[PDB]
């Protein structure tokens, strides 16, 4: 059975392949090579997991095909879902409902987690009878025991306007927010022909009628948008409200989160913001990142770029990696070297393992020699293409003559550009 | 006032293009957005998994009936052989569908759930000079907000009141021509189509027309 997530480009990278001493292995859990780069990535991963210091920023630089994105996925799989890992491309901040700066702020805050723990007294049971005269009584049941409660006017008004009825499995808290839980299985056969879309029939509780709810849940600090409007959780399902006021973001939510942390009702777990293709940012966004990194509770930035000395967007100026010098001063730069005849063959072997393709050692030799001439990223695509061309030939293993069947159908950037002698 | 307010005219089937009763799929198995104000973290994560009502227990409560309570005291031809078979058949169908629907109507959990949003949602005037509602001086935010700061936000009520003197004198502009709503829309319409719009306008004009009463002096 095929599921939502299937074999993508970085699917084989199940982690960052490092020893307990952070020493990288020759070939380990998905990743191959890049010893220097993977050791550096492991170190910044460790400072992510410690969490003590704020606004650290790392730039993964190097040529196309070294493993910058691969290393980022290694870091992201090595890190558990507990710590928020936010991945965007630099192109995603170029919004219409927001400015560059506000979108970048929202990403920063999406990279900070807050583990709520909430602890509430609850009354739960099947309603046996309701009476109303205004005042009345309510008979609640759990499979263990039954009780009466006397109702005041607010409780009565939230029985009637809720249209609670005999048989409803009801649930009530201190400072009541009464929610209907289920429908009794005795007042049944209602679906002899129909049920309401919200109605359920699962059975009444057991044990004591009064219990305690523990609820634990990681929101991101971007839960600021949960208080930017009248009804506001909606905007977490449609991106909605755009520039929510800084006067509520930076003091009210941070202050109340600190109060929760001190009482013990919450804890910030700072995570990662990975901006891929970061060269796409404008000097406005870069100069914003300048101050954003200095802030008290920024995540760690990871950036990836493949640019040389190039023009900074929004300027006529040229700089390393296409990002300003005043921001490179704020980064630690991890360089990535290309692969040789030894590591190209091995990552092709890994990709065959992931895509479940079997190749002749001749075919591996040919595919490596082809990848070392045109592009690494192309030899990975020929794997699947040859698997398919060999599947129709009534074969079971990709063969040297099949790599050539693919090699002439799907032509590289090199040969593709070389055949533009026609100039239509 | 122009009675020449236009009314658009269309075909029946045009107004019925996007309806189908028994060829459309049930989207109620996918709508996360509809849970958030109404379903609980505890309900989906803790209650339903324990108290899941198996096909078995509902077929059981379809056995002989339960006896009545006693709360008063205080001390502190023939039958067709095929007819009964068919009745049994469709009773079984009925119960299996109670199972199907009671499972399908509790199959997915909230993205957040009501108590998460309650925990996160701060008292409503989040960052204002004016405080939220306070139960009394027993609790902290009664002693943090001055009344003199409250006197300066001048809610829209006093805006209308203090402008009233110049509302009475300087508001005189009218559009030179006026027409009923943008158009009427005549056809051989779906029967339910008209009741629903009338009910919606009842539901609106019943709630916030009293709220438009303050604007009546300007209007």
């Amino acid at each position: 059975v095929t599921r939502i997530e299937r074999i993508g480009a970085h699917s084989h990278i199940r982690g960052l392949g490092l020893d307990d001493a952070l020493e990288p292995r020759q070939a380990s859990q998905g990743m191959v090579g890049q010893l220097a780069a993977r050791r550096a990535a492991g170190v910044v991963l460790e400072m992510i997991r410690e969490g003590k210091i704020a606004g650290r920023a790392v730039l993964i630089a190097g040529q196309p095909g070294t493993g910058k994105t691969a290393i980022a996925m290694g870091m992201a799989q090595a890190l558990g879902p507990d710590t928020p890992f936010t991945a965007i491309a630099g192109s995603e901040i170029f919004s219409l409902e927001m400015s560059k700066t506000e979108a970048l702020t929202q990403a920063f805050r999406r990279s900070i987690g807050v583990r709520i723990k909430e602890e509430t007294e609850i009354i739960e049971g099947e309603v046996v009878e309701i009476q109303i005269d205004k005042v009345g009584k309510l008979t609640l049941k759990t499979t263990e025991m039954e009780t009466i409660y006397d109702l005041g006017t607010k409780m009565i008004e939230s029985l009637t306007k809720d249209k609670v009825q005999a048989g409803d499995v009801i649930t009530i808290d201190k400072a009541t927010g009464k929610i209907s839980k289920l429908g009794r299985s005795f007042t049944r056969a209602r679906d002899y022909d129909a049920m309401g879309s919200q109605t359920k029939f699962v059975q009444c509780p057991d044990g004591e009628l009064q219990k305690r709810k523990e609820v634990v849940h990681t929101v991101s600090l971007h839960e600021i948008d949960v208080i930017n409007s009248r009804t506001q959780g909606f905007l977490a399902l449609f991106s909605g409200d755009t520039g929510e006021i800084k006067s509520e973001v930076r003091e009210q939510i941070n202050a109340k989160v600190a109060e929760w942390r001190e009482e013990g009702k919450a804890e910030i777990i700072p995570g990662v913001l990975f901006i891929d293709e970061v060269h796409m940012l404008d000097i406005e966004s870069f100069s914003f990142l300048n101050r954003a990194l200095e802030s008290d509770m920024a995540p760690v930035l990871i950036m990836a770029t493949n640019r040389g000395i190039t023009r900074i967007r929004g300027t006529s100026y040229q700089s390393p990696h296409g990002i300003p010098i005043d921001l490179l001063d704020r980064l630690l730069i991890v360089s990535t070297t290309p692969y040789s005849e030894k590591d190209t063959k091995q990552i092709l072997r890994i990709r065959c393992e992931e895509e479940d393709v079997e190749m002749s050692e001749d075919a591996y030799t040919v595919l490596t020699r082809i990848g070392l001439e045109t592009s690494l990223r192309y030899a990975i695509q020929l794997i699947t293409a040859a698997s398919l061309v060999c599947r129709k030939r009534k074969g079971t293993e990709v063969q040297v003559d099949d790599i050539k069947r693919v090699y002439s159908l799907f032509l590289d950037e090199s040969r593709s550009t070389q055949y533009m002698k026609e100039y239509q | 006032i122009t009675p020449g307010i236009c009314f658009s005219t269309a075909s029946l089937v045009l107004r019925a293009t996007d309806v189908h009763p028994l060829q459309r799929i049930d989207m109620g198995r996918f709508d996360l957005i509809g849970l958030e104000g109404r379903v609980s973290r505890y309900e989906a994560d803790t209650f339903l998994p324990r108290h899941r009502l198996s096909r078995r227990v509902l077929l059981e409560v379809a056995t002989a009936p339960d006896p009545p309570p006693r709360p008063k005291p205080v001390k502190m031809p023939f039958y067709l052989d095929s007819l009964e078979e068919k009745r049994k058949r469709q009773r079984s169908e009925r119960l299996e569908r109670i199972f199907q629907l009671s499972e399908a109507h509790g199959a997915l959990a909230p993205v957040y759930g009501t108590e998460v949003l309650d925990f996160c949602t701060l008292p409503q005037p989040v960052a204002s000079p004016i405080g939220p509602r306070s139960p009394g001086p027993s609790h902290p935010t009664f002693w943090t907000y001055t009344e003199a700061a409250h006197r300066a936000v001048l809610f829209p009520q006093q805006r209308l009141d203090q402008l009233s003197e110049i509302i009475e004198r300087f508001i005189f502009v009218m559009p030179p021509v006026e027409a009923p709503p943008p158009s009427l829309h005549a056809c051989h319409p779906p029967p339910w189509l008209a009741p629903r719009q009338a009910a919606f306008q009842e539901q609106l004009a019943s709630e916030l027309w009293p709220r438009a009463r303050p604007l009546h002096r300007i209007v």
Partner: peptide
């Protein structure tokens, strides 16, 4: 809860006796 069970037992005995 077990107190409720005990109490109900006593009540049922009384009802049966009368």
């Amino acid at each position: 809860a077990r107190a409720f069970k005990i109490i109900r037992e006593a009540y049922k005995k009384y009802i049966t006796a009368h």
